């Protein structure tokens, strides 16, 4: 009876840990994507600055 319960617990824990790992790291991925858009415009100022110089 203990074994029958232990195996389902471990089986469900695989999915819970998997989904938690995804959710945990989901923030930094978007932070990278957002910075990707930002940096393009940060250095775009250099182009405009040089053009007036």
């Amino acid at each position: 009876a203990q074994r029958d319960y232990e195996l389902k617990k471990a089986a469900y824990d695989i999915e819970v840990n998997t989904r938690r790992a995804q959710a945990d790291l989901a923030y930094q991925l978007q932070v990278a994507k957002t910075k990707q858009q930002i940096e393009e415009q940060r250095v775009q100022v250099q182009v405009v600055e040089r053009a007036q110089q």
Binding site: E6, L7, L25
Partner: protein, 51 residues
């Protein structure tokens, strides 16, 4: 004493069946325990790829 030793044998044969099955069940538990512990890295390393 003759009956004693015979009683001790039947207690041992009962012991035998139990410890044998504990071992079989523990193998299964131990196996899926490792996976439950390490799944965070299997997913973590896989997510660092996109990051």
């Amino acid at each position: 004493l003759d009956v004693k030793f015979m009683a001790d044998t039947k207690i041992a044969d009962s012991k035998r069946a139990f410890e044998l099955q504990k071992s079989a069940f523990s193998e299964e538990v131990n196996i899926k325990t490792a996976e439950a512990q390490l799944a965070y890295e299997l997913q973590g390393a896989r997510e660092q790829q996109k990051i």
